[PDB]
């Protein structure tokens, strides 16, 4: 019902879509494709994480769910950024 929550939810879904594509292509050794999807995923993760979600009005199961989505997104953003830098610098094992 709050518009800030749907932004978080949309970012969560899109980020997963692109990071999953990135991981699929990465596992298949398609490193240029992977970097592409990872960068798109980063954009969505950043947006979802950027939404203020600890204010006074931010109460209830919806906001709680949104915060947990952002928790997940911050963790994944760290992992994607690491893998991206590794691929960009050609250090993939």
């Amino acid at each position: 019902e709050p518009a800030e929550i749907k932004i978080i939810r949309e970012a969560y879904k899109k980020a997963f879509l692109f990071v999953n594509k990135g991981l699929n292509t990465d596992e298949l050794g398609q490193k240029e494709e992977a970097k592409n999807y990872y960068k798109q995923g980063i954009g969505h993760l950043l947006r979802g994480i950027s939404i203020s979600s600890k204010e006074s009005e931010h109460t209830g199961p919806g906001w709680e769910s949104a915060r947990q989505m952002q928790q997940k997104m911050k963790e994944t953003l760290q992992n994607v950024r690491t893998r991206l830098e590794i691929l960009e610098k050609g250090l993939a094992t």
Partner: peptide
């Protein structure tokens, strides 16, 4: 059935 935890697992595996 979106599971971000599964993503983390796959990144860890790519390091091996």
């Amino acid at each position: 059935d979106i599971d971000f935890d599964d993503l983390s697992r796959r990144f860890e595996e790519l390091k091996k």
